[PDB]
RNA sequence: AUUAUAAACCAGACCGUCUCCUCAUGGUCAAUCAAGACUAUGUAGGGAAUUUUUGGA
């Protein structure tokens, strides 16, 4: 259904998320929430190349994000259309 | 439930300070607390970023537009947690 | 000395298949005037495989008369039922209700069976009383098979029983080692049995799966309702009858 | 900074965290109460300013935060 | 018996035992030991002993600093043992038991020793099980399967299976254990409240229930049907009553299905089957054929036991009595007719020489010949039967010709295979409607009206039994099929 | 593709040595061996040598170690503990007792 | 439960998203807008409820002008995840 | 008297090994004249357009 279900699957991938105010942050996604709250272990910074402000471990509020890019270059999607149907076994 | 809300409720009758979107800080009493963080105060000091500070009797604040709210150090460990 | 026995027996119990390498009966002469019984070297073997060296293990047995000779009794089915075995004596559950299963087409309760370790020419108080308890007015003509067992050889001692025995049984089930003497070797009327592989047979076993309640002493219910599945009957000291030992071991045996 | 492979918010409760807001005012404070909105109550507040270079300081409160205008949360130096 | 070999002929081949050895990195010696020591009539006691004997334990010896621990154990250790304390075999067996029951140790020499067992028990046990299966021996193999399971999941049979879920709590398991209830009973229970009441813990009752509809469980049914005297099909119907979970049940849920004898001594036929998520709940069939033994064939049992057991789930083991009451087999396969030497029948013998021009040969085939007299000349019913390769087609053609000869016309060739029917039609209409003087050849289409029309018109119709059956059914009114005259039921 | 290289090219070359025990009988031989070990050990640890020993068996190890403990206790316990141990002792406490 | 939300699946193809659904189905280039003086181009691939979209072969077009000028910087991007709140206008070009 | 150390089978690519929050679900408890914290199911939902996470840059 939702495209946050796309990023639900991608455990442990390297991204440099463009936030809305404008930032470059290389880090491991881990588990993302259905409100787009991702958890980032290692980090590079840019406060408003761009200067390294010396932080390591971030945890994102899912409101902030503009564009996520470069964890993996794949196309695999659906799930709920399978599960609803194969549970209809006995009435 | 949300623990911060509970904490706020507990601290009804404390000298709570404030900071909004614009930065218009305050410091008066806590009159009442709600699920959405709506607050009312008494004997409230107005110390804005503009410089022209004033002394106001009562004030009510919208919760959504809050950046944060200040609390004293008494309700730190107990009694809200467990 | 109460721990030394059971374990030893269990270890011994591996040599029970061997007890049917040799099998022989001092064969009494045959008589069509009575009903003659047909037991399979398979079922018997299986029973012996389950049994203890020391102890009375004891199922019911079932089957029906073939249309060849309506005097014959083909023993198609053991019905291994709940029991707590003592050495030379046995508590046993009710006549099993077994119309629920398939292949129970008009199966008469033919009788029962047991182990022991003394080759008599009669039934003891341990046995006779038990028999009486089982089949008071439910079936008088139903029979017993003792299987005397000893290293090298098991031998089949079939027995019938007269109506005077049942009466005795009702009273003297509890104690009464002189009463049996009074009663005597009689009335354990030697009955006719054959051994074959020209037929074979199966067990009904408790649906629980655990007929021997030795160490499940608290569970057993002499006049209790139990379900009965078709199944492979378990060895007397099979890990499912022995649960407590395992538990004890777990509660570290190396403190 | 010394902070390990911490999996979730509940596994990093009671840590001295840098916190970031919409205007750019940077914080520091010990994490007390997780939430739906990340209204994370801090043990003590020291907010910092930069004019529109160089960073300033404040110390008024020990605050119940509100999540709306937060950006993200970063560990500074653990307790004990 | 790890290989097959001829000294002079020089032909090598790998057995099943050899394969087993390969896969389960056995030292041939160990395999050999197993081969003799595992035996139709081996028992649990023995099985541990056999494991101990495994010759990846040639270098393991009893040791004084261990001894005390062994002594403490070997009294209470719940597999009975034949050996006595100084023997290393006994020690090994007790270590195995400890491992099964989780008895992590103080005097670490033993613990080091037990480490080895842990890394290599599951292997050896599995190998043994496989061997047993190959042999076809019930007693060990079910017991061996159980052993394997134990090794996998570090607990005994009497240790209640919940234990092997990650998520069930400790208090519950203890309660379950002591209570001395036939586990199956718990599984059977319907209401979570009920479960709570009867888990000595009305707390977590719902959770446990969720974790019982999270447990494998199958109301299997299986009737066999005797194909022929020797052969027996067995129609199994396996229902998967449990609810899957990709954390718990894995990518699939294997189930080593045995068919085994009235005793439970010998395997008859076995198979692994993977129940998948997809399967679960679907009443899903499974068939296999089992030949028989001469004696068995003669006098046959009251049953076998077909027996699913999971390669994981403790006390899964759904065994059912493959009913045999009055399974009266057939009469020893009736005999095939004889081929006499008389292939002289040919395109000469057929009457008019128009029909000679259709065959692209002169003399018929061996079998074709054997039937020709009955087929072509006389106007009576024919069963040919066989054979694949040999011209059924030719025979059919001959029959058709014969029919034509007496001025009959109404032909109906009925093969099932439509894609070959079409071919036949293609190479009949070109080779046949000419020579009769216009006899119309039609493969039936789909829709009934068209077919009817064709029938009304056409002389020869070709039809899939389905289609022609459909056409016929209303024959009391459709009086064209009333007046059909020859029918070549192909295949 | 072949590359033989000898102890010549070793990072720390093996300065080989031997003992050559004259005695025969095991109950004296063992004692002699122990003595030799002590003598070598003494020579070593005076030069700041942190040392390894091997034996044959597990049961031998502890008994050897025990013997050693009840050898230097006579002469000098000092040169194995040496350091004042205000932090070192704490460290020892932390890991030795657990 | 199942019917109340899944009926909105066809609401993509009827409602104002229909265009972008179509685009997604048969990948085509579209002008992609943003809040702070931005212009973006790419072809459509995966589609959601709230404009949290994914594309391919993406071109950003934007300016950093320190002194009354325009400096249209350009860089190639691929397999993004734009948060749908930032999107304003999208349109299927021939 | 008394024995070195050491590696190992098996199910997997047609396939979601793993969720932060609210609502319901039955089983519980802590309780007052009809309401709150916990395990557990995912069968619900998360632009509830404004009090937060989908737009005041």
Swiss-Prot record, chain C:
Domain MPN intervals: 36-165
Q: Where in the cell is it found?
A: Nucleus
Q: What is said about the domains? A: The MPN (JAB/Mov34) domain has structural similarity with deubiquitinating enzymes, but lacks the residues that would bind the catalytic metal ion. Contains a region with structural similarity to reverse transcriptase, presenting the classical thumb, fingers and palm architecture, but lacks enzyme activity, since the essential metal-binding residues are not conserved.
Other facts noted in the record for this chain: Present with 468 molecules/cell in log phase SD medium.
Q: What does this protein do, in the record's words? A: Functions as a scaffold that mediates the ordered assembly of spliceosomal proteins and snRNAs. Required for association of BRR2 with the spliceosomal U5 snRNP, and the subsequent assembly of the U4/U6-U5 tri-snRNP complex. Functions as a scaffold that positions spliceosomal U2, U5 and U6 snRNAs at splice sites on pre-mRNA substrates, so that splicing can occur. Interacts with both the 5' and the 3' splice site, as well as the branch region. Has a role in branch site-3' splice site selection. Associates with the branch site-3' splice 3'-exon region. Also has a role in cell cycle.
Q: What is this protein called?
A: Pre-mRNA-splicing factor 8
Query: Coding gene?
Result: PRP8
- Report where the shown chain sits in the full-length sequence: first residue, last residue, total length: 2147 to 2401 of 2413
Curated annotation (Swiss-Prot), chain D:
GO BP terms:
7-methylguanosine cap hypermethylation; mRNA 5'-splice site recognition; mRNA splicing, via spliceosome; spliceosomal complex assembly; spliceosomal snRNP assembly; U2-type prespliceosome assembly
Sm domain boundaries: 4-79
Tell me where in or outside the cell this protein is found: Nucleus; Cytoplasm
Please indicate if the UniProt record lists Transmembrane as a keyword: no
* Entry keywords, A to Z: Cytoplasm, mRNA processing, mRNA splicing, Nucleus, Ribonucleoprotein, RNA-binding
| GO CC terms in record | catalytic step 2 spliceosome; commitment complex; cytoplasm; nucleus; Prp19 complex; spliceosomal complex; U1 snRNP; U2 snRNP
- Report the GO molecular function annotations: RNA binding; snRNP binding
- Give a yes or no for keyword Cytoplasm in this entry: yes
Q: What else is known?
A: Present with 861 molecules/cell in log phase SD medium.
Comment block on domains = C-terminal extension may function as a nuclear localization signal (NLS).
Query: What family classification does the UniProt entry report for this protein?
Result: Belongs to the snRNP SmB/SmN family.
**Subunit composition?**
Component of the Sm core complex, present in spliceosomal snRNP U1, U2, U4/U6 and U5. The core complex contains SMB1, SMD1, SMD2, SMD3, SME1, SMX3 and SMX2 (Sm proteins B, D1, D2, D3, E, F and G, respectively), and is probably a heptameric ring structure. SMB1 specifically interacts with SMD3.
Query: What is the protein's known function?
Result: Plays a role in pre-mRNA splicing as a core component of the spliceosomal U1, U2, U4 and U5 small nuclear ribonucleoproteins (snRNPs), the building blocks of the spliceosome.
The protein in question is named Small nuclear ribonucleoprotein-associated protein B
**Gene field:** SMB1
Swiss-Prot record, chain E:
Name the Gene Ontology biological process terms. mRNA splicing, via spliceosome; spliceosome conformational change to release U4 (or U4atac) and U1 (or U11)
> Where this protein primarily resides, as one coarse class?
nucleus
Q: Where in the cell is it found?
A: Nucleus
Domain SEC63: where?
14-324
Q: Which residues bind ATP?
A: 386-393
Please provide, in alphabetical order, the Gene Ontology terms of the cellular component aspect for this entry: nucleus; Prp19 complex; spliceosomal complex; U4/U6 x U5 tri-snRNP complex; U5 snRNP
Helicase ATP-binding domain residues are 373-491
A molecular function annotated in GO for this UniProt entry is:
identical protein binding
Keyword annotations for this protein, in alphabetical order, are: ATP-binding, Helicase, Hydrolase, mRNA processing, mRNA splicing, Nucleotide-binding, Nucleus, Phosphoprotein, Repeat, Spliceosome
What is the role of the protein in this entry? RNA helicase that plays an essential role in pre-mRNA splicing as component of the U5 snRNP and U4/U6-U5 tri-snRNP complexes. Involved in spliceosome assembly, activation and disassembly. Mediates changes in the dynamic network of RNA-RNA interactions in the spliceosome. Catalyzes the ATP-dependent unwinding of U4/U6 RNA duplices, an essential step in the assembly of a catalytically active spliceosome.
Q: Which family does it belong to?
A: Belongs to the helicase family. SKI2 subfamily.
The annotated subunit structure for this chain is: Component of the U4/U6-U5 tri-snRNP complex composed of the U4, U6 and U5 snRNAs and at least PRP3, PRP4, PRP6, PRP8, PRP18, PRP31, PRP38, SNU13, SNU23, SNU66, SNU114, SPP381, SMB1, SMD1, SMD2, SMD3, SMX2, SMX3, LSM2, LSM3, LSM4, LSM5, LSM6, LSM7, LSM8, BRR2 and DIB1. Interaction with PRP8 is important for recruitment to the U4/U6-U5 tri-snRNP complex.
What more the UniProt record tells us is: Present with 1440 molecules/cell in log phase SD medium.
Gene assigned in the entry: BRR2
Curated annotation (Swiss-Prot), chain G:
| SUPFAM superfamilies reported for this sequence | Sm-like ribonucleoproteins
Q: Do you know which Pfam families this protein is assigned to?
A: LSM
Fill in the misc note.
Present with 799 molecules/cell in log phase SD medium.
Keyword annotations: Cytoplasm, mRNA processing, mRNA splicing, Nucleus, Ribonucleoprotein, RNA-binding
Provide the protein's localization.
Nucleus; Cytoplasm, Cytosol
* Name the UniProt record assigns to this protein: Small nuclear ribonucleoprotein Sm D2
Residue ranges of domain Sm in the record: 17-94
Give GO terms for biological process: 7-methylguanosine cap hypermethylation; mRNA 5'-splice site recognition; mRNA splicing, via spliceosome; spliceosomal complex assembly; spliceosomal snRNP assembly; U2-type prespliceosome assembly
Functional note: Plays a role in pre-mRNA splicing as a core component of the spliceosomal U1, U2, U4 and U5 small nuclear ribonucleoproteins (snRNPs), the building blocks of the spliceosome.
Similarity section: Belongs to the snRNP core protein family.
Which Gene3D superfamilies does the record cross-reference, listed alphabetically?
2.30.30.100
Q: Which InterPro entries match?
A: LSM_dom_sf (IPR010920), Sm (IPR047575), Sm_D2 (IPR027248), Sm_dom_euk/arc (IPR001163)
**Keyword RNA-binding recorded:** yes
Keyword Nucleus part of the UniProt annotation = yes
Subunit field text: Component of the Sm core complex, present in spliceosomal snRNP U1, U2, U4/U6 and U5. The core complex contains SMB1, SMD1, SMD2, SMD3, SME1, SMX3 and SMX2 (Sm proteins B, D1, D2, D3, E, F and G, respectively), and is probably a heptameric ring structure.
- One example GO MF annotation: RNA binding
CDD domains hit by this protein? Sm_D2
Q: Which GO terms describe its cellular component?
A: catalytic step 2 spliceosome; commitment complex; cytoplasm; cytosol; nucleus; pICln-Sm protein complex; precatalytic spliceosome; Prp19 complex
């Amino acid at each position: 259904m939702k495209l946050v279900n796309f990023l639900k699957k991608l455990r442990n991938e390297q991204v440099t998320i463009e936030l809305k105010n404008g930032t470059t942050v290389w880090g491991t996604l881990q588990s993302v929430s259905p409100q787009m709250n991702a958890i980032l272990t290692d980090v590079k910074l840019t406060l408003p190349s761009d200067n390294i402000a010396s932080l390591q471990y971030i945890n994102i509020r899912g409101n902030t994000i503009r564009q996520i890019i470069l964890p993996d270059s794949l196309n695999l999607d659906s799930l709920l259309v399978d599960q609803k149907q194969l549970n209809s076994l006995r009435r | 439930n949300g623990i911060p809300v509970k904490l706020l409720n507990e601290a009804q009758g404390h000298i709570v300070s404030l900071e909004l979107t614009t930065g218009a800080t305050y410091r008066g009493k806590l009159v009442e607390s709600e699920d959405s963080m709506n607050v009312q105060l008494r004997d409230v000091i107005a110390t804005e970023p503009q410089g022209a500070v004033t002394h106001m009797d009562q004030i009510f604040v919208r919760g959504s537009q809050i950046k944060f709210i200040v609390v004293p150090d008494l309700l730190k460990n107990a009694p809200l947690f467990k | 000395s109460s721990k030394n026995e059971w374990r030893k027996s269990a270890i011994a119990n591996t040599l029970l298949y061997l007890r049917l390498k040799n099998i022989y009966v001092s064969a009494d002469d045959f008589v069509e005037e009575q009903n003659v019984y047909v037991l399979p070297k398979n079922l018997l073997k299986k029973f012996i495989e389950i049994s203890d060296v020391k102890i009375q293990v004891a199922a019911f047995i079932y089957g029906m008369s073939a249309k060849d000779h309506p005097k014959v009794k083909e023993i198609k089915t053991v019905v291994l039922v709940p029991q707590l075995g003592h050495v030379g004596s046995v508590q046993i559950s009710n006549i099993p209700d077994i119309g629920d299963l398939p292949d129970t087409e008009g199966l008469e309760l033919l009788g029962w069976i047991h182990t022991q370790t003394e080759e008599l020419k009669f039934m003891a108080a341990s046995e006779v009383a038990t028999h009486s308890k089982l089949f008071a007015d439910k079936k008088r003509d139903c029979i017993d098979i003792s299987i005397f067992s000893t290293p090298g050889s098991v031998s089949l001692s079939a027995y019938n029983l007269t109506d005077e025995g049942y009466q005795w049984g009702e009273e003297n089930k509890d104690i009464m080692n002189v009463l049996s003497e009074g009663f005597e070797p009689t009335f354990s009327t030697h009955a006719q049995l054959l051994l074959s592989d020209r037929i074979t047979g199966n067990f009904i076993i408790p649906s629980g799966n655990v007929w021997n309640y030795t160490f499940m002493g608290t569970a057993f219910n002499q006049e209790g309702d139990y379900n009965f599945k078709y199944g492979i009957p378990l060895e007397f000291y099979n890990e499912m009858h022995r649960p407590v030992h395992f538990l004890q071991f777990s509660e570290l045996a190396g403190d | 900074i010394q902070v390990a492979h911490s999996s979730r918010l509940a596994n990093l409760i009671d840590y001295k965290l840098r916190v970031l807001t919409q205007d750019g005012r940077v914080y520091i404070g010990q994490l007390m109460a997780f939430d739906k909105h990340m209204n994370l109550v801090l043990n003590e507040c020291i907010e910092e300013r930069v004019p529109k270079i160089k960073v300033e300081k404040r110390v008024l409160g020990l605050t119940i935060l509100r999540g709306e205008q937060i950006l993200s949360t970063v560990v500074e130096d653990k307790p004990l | 018996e790890l290989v097959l070999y001829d000294a002079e002929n020089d032909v090598i081949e790998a057995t099943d035992l050899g394969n087993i050895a390969s896969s389960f990195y056995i030292n041939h010696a160990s395999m050999d030991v197993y081969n003799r020591e595992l035996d139709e009539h081996t028992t649990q006691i023995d099985l541990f002993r056999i494991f101990s004997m495994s010759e990846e334990f040639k270098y393991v010896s009893v040791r004084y600093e261990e001894k005390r621990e062994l002594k403490q154990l070997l009294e209470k250790a719940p597999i009975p043992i034949r050996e006595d304390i100084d023997d290393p075999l006994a020690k090994v067996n007790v270590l195995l038991q400890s491992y099964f029951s989780q008895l992590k140790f103080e005097g670490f020499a033993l613990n080091s020793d037990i480490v080895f067992i842990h890394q290599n028990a599951g292997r050896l046990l599995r190998a043994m099980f496989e061997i047993c299966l190959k042999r076809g021996w019930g007693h060990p193999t079910r017991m061996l399967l159980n052993l394997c399971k134990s090794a996998t999941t570090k607990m005994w049979p009497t240790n209640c299976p919940l234990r092997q879920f990650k998520t069930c709590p400790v208090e519950v398991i203890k309660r379950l254990e002591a209570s001395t209830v036939p586990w199956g009973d718990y599984l059977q229970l319907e209401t979570p409240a009920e479960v709570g009441r009867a888990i000595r813990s009305e707390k977590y009752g719902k959770q446990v229930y969720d974790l019982l509809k999270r447990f494998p469980k199958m109301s299997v049914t299986c009737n066999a049907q005797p194909i022929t005297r020797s052969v027996m099909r067995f129609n199994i119907e396996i229902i998967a009553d449990w609810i899957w979970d990709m954390n718990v049940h894995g990518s699939l849920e294997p189930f080593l299905l045995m068919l085994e004898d009235t005793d439970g001594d010998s395997i008859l036929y076995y198979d692994v089957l993977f129940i998948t998520p997809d399967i679960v709940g679907h009443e899903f069939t499974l068939s296999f054929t089992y030949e028989l033994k001469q004696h068995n064939q003669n006098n046959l049992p009251p049953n076998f036991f077909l027996t699913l057991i999971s390669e994981n789930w403790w006390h899964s083991e759904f065994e059912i009595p493959v009913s045999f009451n009055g399974f009266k087999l057939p009469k020893k396969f009736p005999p095939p007719t004889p081929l006499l030497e008389n292939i002289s029948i040919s395109t000469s013998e057929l009457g008019n020489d128009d029909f000679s021009e259709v065959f692209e040969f002169k003399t018929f085939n061996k079998i074709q010949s054997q039937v020709f007299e009955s087929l072509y000349n006389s106007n009576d019913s024919v069963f040919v039967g066989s054979g694949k390769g040999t011209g059924k087609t030719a025979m059919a053609e001959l029959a058709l010709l014969n029919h034509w000869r007496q001025n009959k016309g109404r032909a109906v060739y009925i093969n099932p295979s439509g894609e070959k029917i079409d071919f036949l039609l293609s190479d009949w209409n070109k080779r046949f409607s000419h020579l009769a003087g216009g006899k119309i050849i039609n493969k039936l289409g789909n829709d009934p009206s068209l077919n009817l029309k064709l029938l009304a018109k056409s002389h020869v119709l070709l039809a899939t039994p389905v289609q022609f059956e459909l056409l016929s059914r209303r024959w009391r009114q459709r009086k064209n099929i009333q007046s059909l005259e020859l029918m070549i039921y192909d295949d | 593709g072949l590359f033989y290289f000898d102890s010549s090219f070793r990072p720390c070359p093996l300065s080989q040595q031997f003992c050559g025990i004259k005695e025969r009988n095991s109950l004296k031989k063992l004692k002699a061996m122990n003595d030799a070990c002590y003598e070598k050990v003494l020579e070593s640890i005076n030069e700041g040598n942190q040392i390894i020993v091997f034996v044959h068996s597990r049961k031998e190890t502890s008994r050897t170690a025990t013997w050693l403990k009840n050898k230097f206790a006579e002469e000098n316990i000092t040169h194995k503990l040496t350091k004042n141990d205000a932090g070192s002792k704490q460290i020892l406490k932390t890991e030795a007792a657990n | 439960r199942a019917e109340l939300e899944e009926l909105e699946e066809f609401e993509f193809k009827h409602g104002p998203m229909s265009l972008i659904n179509d685009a997604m189905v048969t990948r085509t280039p579209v002008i992609i807008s943003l809040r702070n003086n931005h212009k973006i181009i790419a072809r459509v691939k995966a589609f959601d409820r709230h404009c949290n979209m994914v594309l391919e072969n993406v071109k950003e077009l934007w300016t950093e002008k320190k002194g009354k000028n325009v400096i249209n910087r350009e860089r190639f991007i691929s397999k993004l995840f734009l948060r749908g709140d930032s999107v304003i206008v999208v349109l299927k070009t021939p």
